[PDB]
Motif scaffolding. Sequence first.
Motif, PDB file in Angstrom:
ATOM      1  N   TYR A 308     -11.248 -32.317   7.146  1.00 32.66           N
ATOM      2  CA  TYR A 308     -12.361 -32.371   8.083  1.00 32.66           C
ATOM      3  C   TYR A 308     -13.408 -33.391   7.650  1.00 32.66           C
ATOM      4  O   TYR A 308     -14.600 -33.121   7.549  1.00 32.66           O
ATOM      5  CB  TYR A 308     -12.951 -30.979   8.271  1.00 32.66           C
ATOM      6  CG  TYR A 308     -13.552 -30.297   7.068  1.00 32.66           C
ATOM      7  CD1 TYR A 308     -12.771 -29.586   6.188  1.00 32.66           C
ATOM      8  CD2 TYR A 308     -14.911 -30.274   6.878  1.00 32.66           C
ATOM      9  CE1 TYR A 308     -13.317 -28.940   5.121  1.00 32.66           C
ATOM     10  CE2 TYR A 308     -15.461 -29.631   5.812  1.00 32.66           C
ATOM     11  CZ  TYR A 308     -14.663 -28.967   4.939  1.00 32.66           C
ATOM     12  OH  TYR A 308     -15.241 -28.327   3.885  1.00 32.66           O
ATOM     13  N   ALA A 359     -14.424 -30.860  12.271  1.00 31.68           N
ATOM     14  CA  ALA A 359     -15.401 -30.325  11.336  1.00 31.68           C
ATOM     15  C   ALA A 359     -15.163 -28.855  11.030  1.00 31.68           C
ATOM     16  O   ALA A 359     -15.920 -28.276  10.240  1.00 31.68           O
ATOM     17  CB  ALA A 359     -16.804 -30.491  11.876  1.00 31.68           C
ATOM     18  N   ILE A 361     -13.042 -25.542   9.544  1.00 34.90           N
ATOM     19  CA  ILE A 361     -12.213 -25.269   8.382  1.00 34.90           C
ATOM     20  C   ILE A 361     -10.966 -24.494   8.780  1.00 34.90           C
ATOM     21  O   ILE A 361      -9.955 -24.519   8.067  1.00 34.90           O
ATOM     22  CB  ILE A 361     -13.038 -24.522   7.321  1.00 34.90           C
ATOM     23  CG1 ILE A 361     -14.234 -25.377   6.901  1.00 34.90           C
ATOM     24  CG2 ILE A 361     -12.172 -24.139   6.131  1.00 34.90           C
ATOM     25  CD1 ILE A 361     -15.518 -25.097   7.674  1.00 34.90           C
ATOM     26  N   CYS A 380      -7.570 -26.326   6.838  1.00 43.63           N
ATOM     27  CA  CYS A 380      -8.029 -27.641   6.438  1.00 43.63           C
ATOM     28  C   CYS A 380      -8.471 -27.614   4.985  1.00 43.63           C
ATOM     29  O   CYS A 380      -8.514 -26.564   4.341  1.00 43.63           O
ATOM     30  CB  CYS A 380      -9.163 -28.110   7.341  1.00 43.63           C
ATOM     31  SG  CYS A 380      -8.743 -28.139   9.097  1.00 43.63           S
ATOM     32  N   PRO A 383     -12.892 -33.178   1.957  1.00 48.75           N
ATOM     33  CA  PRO A 383     -12.647 -34.538   1.483  1.00 48.75           C
ATOM     34  C   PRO A 383     -12.974 -34.722   0.013  1.00 48.75           C
ATOM     35  O   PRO A 383     -13.920 -34.142  -0.521  1.00 48.75           O
ATOM     36  CB  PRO A 383     -13.591 -35.374   2.337  1.00 48.75           C
ATOM     37  CG  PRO A 383     -13.892 -34.554   3.472  1.00 48.75           C
ATOM     38  CD  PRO A 383     -13.934 -33.189   2.982  1.00 48.75           C
ATOM     39  N   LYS A 384     -12.189 -35.587  -0.628  1.00 44.65           N
ATOM     40  CA  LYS A 384     -12.423 -35.957  -2.017  1.00 44.65           C
ATOM     41  C   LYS A 384     -13.644 -36.859  -2.144  1.00 44.65           C
ATOM     42  O   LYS A 384     -14.318 -36.851  -3.178  1.00 44.65           O
ATOM     43  CB  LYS A 384     -11.170 -36.645  -2.580  1.00 44.65           C
ATOM     44  CG  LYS A 384      -9.926 -35.732  -2.669  1.00 44.65           C
ATOM     45  CD  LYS A 384      -8.601 -36.460  -3.083  1.00 44.65           C
ATOM     46  CE  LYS A 384      -8.113 -37.406  -2.030  1.00 44.65           C
ATOM     47  NZ  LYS A 384      -7.938 -36.755  -0.693  1.00 44.65           N
ATOM     48  N   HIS A 386     -17.418 -38.433  -0.526  1.00 45.67           N
ATOM     49  CA  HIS A 386     -18.602 -37.876   0.109  1.00 45.67           C
ATOM     50  C   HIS A 386     -19.624 -38.904   0.560  1.00 45.67           C
ATOM     51  O   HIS A 386     -20.752 -38.521   0.877  1.00 45.67           O
ATOM     52  CB  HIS A 386     -19.291 -36.862  -0.816  1.00 45.67           C
ATOM     53  CG  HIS A 386     -19.602 -37.381  -2.180  1.00 45.67           C
ATOM     54  ND1 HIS A 386     -18.846 -37.057  -3.282  1.00 45.67           N
ATOM     55  CD2 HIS A 386     -20.554 -38.230  -2.618  1.00 45.67           C
ATOM     56  CE1 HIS A 386     -19.345 -37.648  -4.349  1.00 45.67           C
ATOM     57  NE2 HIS A 386     -20.379 -38.374  -3.971  1.00 45.67           N
ATOM     58  N   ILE A 387     -19.278 -40.181   0.607  1.00 43.45           N
ATOM     59  CA  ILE A 387     -20.073 -41.180   1.305  1.00 43.45           C
ATOM     60  C   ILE A 387     -19.123 -42.128   2.012  1.00 43.45           C
ATOM     61  O   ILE A 387     -18.093 -42.517   1.453  1.00 43.45           O
ATOM     62  CB  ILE A 387     -21.005 -41.956   0.362  1.00 43.45           C
ATOM     63  CG1 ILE A 387     -21.993 -41.038  -0.350  1.00 43.45           C
ATOM     64  CG2 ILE A 387     -21.752 -42.989   1.135  1.00 43.45           C
ATOM     65  CD1 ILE A 387     -23.018 -40.374   0.516  1.00 43.45           C
TER      66      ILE A 387
END
Lengths: 394, 18, 48
Positions: A308, A359, A361, A380, A383-384, A386-387
């Motif tokens: 997501y 978005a 889960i 889900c 993500p590994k 975060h920007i």
Amino acid sequence: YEHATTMPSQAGISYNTIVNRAGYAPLPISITPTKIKLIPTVNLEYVTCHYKTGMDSPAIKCCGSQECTPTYRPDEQCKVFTGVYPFMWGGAYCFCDTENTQVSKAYVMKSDDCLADHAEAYKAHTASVQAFLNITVGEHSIVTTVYVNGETPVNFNGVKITAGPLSTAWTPFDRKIVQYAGEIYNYDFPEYGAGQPGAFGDIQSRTVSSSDLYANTNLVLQRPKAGAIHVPYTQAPSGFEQWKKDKAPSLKFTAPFGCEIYTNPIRAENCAVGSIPLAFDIPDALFTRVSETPTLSAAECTLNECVYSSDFGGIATVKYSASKSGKCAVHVPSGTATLKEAAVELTEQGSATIHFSTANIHPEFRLQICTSYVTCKGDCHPPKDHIVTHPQYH
Amino acid sequence: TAPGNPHITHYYHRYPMS
Amino acid sequence: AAGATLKGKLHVPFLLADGKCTVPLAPEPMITFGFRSVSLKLHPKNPT
């Protein structure tokens, strides 16, 4: 057949949606806004630029007395000095030790560089949002500037497209604007004649090339030195230089809701705010009948992966058994997940791959294909990273 | 990438004030 | 002088005109990430 929708005001986010009549097949519609403008209507009040103190030459009288003579110049100050004894190079200008006289005249005029170094004052109102759209409707792609007034349609291919009104009246532009150096500032400038010495408005011309200018600089004449010929002037500095030093940085870098400000045909682009509604009249010939597009049989969606993230980090798969081999459209109605592929190729007994972003889960979304729907579920993972560099496609 | 797995330290970073 | 001094008009040269000027460009910053956070190590040459 009329159809309506609500596309967000955001560039890059390729909106996709499907028109769904009963006896006819789904028609996909893919809409990518490339540039969303916001052009205020603008009224010029005045231009203000640096000043030049115009010192008319000293009228010197020796054993005499002169009286001022008003030439009605901008901020003409006029004084007479007694007890003067000048020096040129040749020597003293006259024997008359006292009972000399020196008429000083000083005025204020607009700099020679005002054709190219001038700040334009503006009253802004009644913006007309204007959007450039890339619109694909049944492999009939088109590219169009459209207005988001109520009734300002654009008609290509018999397809009639109306847009607006916008769901917000926001402008980063206020009732008072200044333009300078290709850059738009939001400044509470005074009216014609209400200037003050030291800030924006100390000089006021209607146009860059006008006749009457309003000047106010606290121009005070002083007495000259004993043995000199000059008009010593003390006044307030250029209020334009102080607007420049103390600058209040531009709306290019201080506007909210993510706006990109631009020059002469003043506009604020890619302002991520609001949702624009559309309205499409579609002539019947663009609709194929379902008897000539592949009606499915026994579909079932799985979910290979779901991240997501902001991107299309979701891959779902549908097994199926259709009647022919061809093309159909896919759409997730809810906001649970948004698709990337607005159309999928379909063989007879294949398994098709669909890409999406989400978005949630624990997704459970209804997915459409040619005619019939499927209930696609799964779990889900985060993500590994975060920007990112792009916004949310969901 | 909030520090936790819902499957706690999660849901206090993501969606704070709760 | 006394009567009427204004005889003519000169033209001022070297007026402020537009064009393009080569301005510098800063060194590439170092961008570390974090949850809801961007950390920037900045190493300039001249004030920026």
